Amino acid sequence: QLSAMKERKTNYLLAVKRELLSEMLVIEWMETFFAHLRLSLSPAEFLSYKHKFDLAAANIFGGAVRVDVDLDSMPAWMSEKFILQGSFSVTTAPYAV
Amino acid sequence: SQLLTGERRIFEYLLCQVGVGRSVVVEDEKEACGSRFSLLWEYDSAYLEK
């Protein structure tokens, strides 16, 4: 049960962690690509593809980041604090009708 | 040995702005097929891992 209540929250929180990490993955794929541009292009090609690099990051990534997270875009499910009290005990006792 | 024209083509593509979000990690395509997964209203896409 506690794993089901855990994955009620943590499957949502690492979904938005994954959501912004997919953004870092395309941010990184921006950088590893252009690192290969600099080592390979002609000096004329660098200016033509740097301006296209400017316009690429201003049109794939120019808008505000839509991964908004403070406490409220989350539903009310992520405000609970589970507790679990009780006591198990083994007894050699009769049944006391 | 061979000059390569390489049969240049008629690639017709659709640049679809696919908005995925809060994806659940899922295995290969055979179980992420709509009629057998049935996502909640929070999660909105399925990440095919393998």
Binding site: L14, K17, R18, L21, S22, M24, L25, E28, W29, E31, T32, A35, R38, L39 | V25, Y47, E49
Partner: peptide, 18 residues
């Protein structure tokens, strides 16, 4: 090479089964 690298390959696997 040229920065990135070691942080690219660690978050390539975005499935956080860790």
């Amino acid at each position: 090479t040229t920065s990135s690298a070691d942080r690219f390959d660690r978050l390539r696997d975005i499935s956080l089964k860790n």
